[PDB]
Tab-separated table of C-alpha atoms in Angstrom:
chain	number	residue	atom	x	y	z
A	1	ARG	CA	1.207	-17.784	3.054
A	2	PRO	CA	-1.885	-20.225	3.577
A	3	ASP	CA	-4.928	-18.837	3.636
A	4	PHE	CA	-5.740	-20.425	6.721
A	5	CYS	CA	-3.355	-18.835	8.409
A	6	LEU	CA	-6.241	-15.459	8.125
A	7	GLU	CA	-8.823	-17.340	9.808
A	8	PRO	CA	-9.792	-16.771	13.572
A	9	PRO	CA	-9.259	-19.744	16.336
A	10	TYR	CA	-11.702	-22.288	16.533
A	11	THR	CA	-12.236	-23.577	20.020
A	12	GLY	CA	-15.009	-26.377	18.394
A	13	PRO	CA	-17.559	-28.245	20.045
A	14	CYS	CA	-15.873	-30.459	22.476
A	15	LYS	CA	-15.687	-29.381	26.400
A	16	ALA	CA	-11.634	-30.148	26.899
A	17	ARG	CA	-9.798	-27.308	27.634
A	18	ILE	CA	-5.973	-27.532	25.470
A	19	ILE	CA	-4.317	-24.470	25.373
A	20	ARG	CA	-3.078	-24.304	21.405
A	21	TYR	CA	-1.489	-21.227	19.325
A	22	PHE	CA	-3.166	-19.595	16.437
A	23	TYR	CA	-1.753	-16.940	13.988
A	24	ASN	CA	-3.212	-13.861	14.695
A	25	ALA	CA	-2.391	-12.250	11.258
A	26	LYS	CA	-4.202	-8.935	12.479
A	27	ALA	CA	-1.975	-8.158	15.338
A	28	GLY	CA	0.748	-10.342	13.233
A	29	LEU	CA	1.959	-12.437	16.215
A	30	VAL	CA	1.096	-15.797	17.401
A	31	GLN	CA	-1.235	-16.001	20.155
A	32	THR	CA	-2.887	-18.696	22.587
A	33	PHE	CA	-6.364	-20.097	22.221
A	34	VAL	CA	-8.548	-22.773	24.003
A	35	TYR	CA	-9.574	-25.601	21.826
A	36	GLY	CA	-12.404	-27.779	23.248
A	37	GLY	CA	-10.754	-31.139	21.475
A	38	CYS	CA	-12.540	-32.143	18.360
A	39	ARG	CA	-12.925	-30.283	14.956
A	40	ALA	CA	-10.103	-28.401	14.691
A	41	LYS	CA	-9.143	-25.978	11.904
A	42	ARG	CA	-6.053	-25.227	10.174
A	43	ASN	CA	-5.390	-22.150	12.349
A	44	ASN	CA	-4.459	-24.422	15.570
A	45	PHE	CA	-0.846	-25.481	16.116
A	46	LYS	CA	0.373	-28.004	19.395
A	47	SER	CA	3.257	-24.907	19.989
A	48	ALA	CA	3.946	-21.671	18.841
A	49	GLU	CA	7.237	-22.452	16.553
A	50	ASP	CA	4.523	-24.493	14.735
A	51	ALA	CA	2.453	-21.426	14.157
A	52	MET	CA	5.462	-19.398	13.042
A	53	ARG	CA	6.974	-21.470	10.714
A	54	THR	CA	3.177	-22.069	9.057
A	55	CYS	CA	1.883	-18.758	9.229
A	56	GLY	CA	4.902	-16.313	9.509
A	57	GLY	CA	6.244	-17.106	5.704
A	58	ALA	CA	6.047	-15.215	2.988
C-alpha cells in the first residue's frame, strides 16, 4: 500500500472549493475533503474509485 495513503488530506494554498477524495487509513474508508486547487499531495483523487484502487490495495 503506498505510504502516501497514510497522509492526512491537504487543502493547499489556493482558494478554489473543489471536492476531492482521499483514503482515511484510520477510518479504513474513502472520504471527501475540500481541495483549494494547487499544490496537491498524493492522497488526492478525482473519484472515490481512484482512491480505493490506489489505497485500498495490499
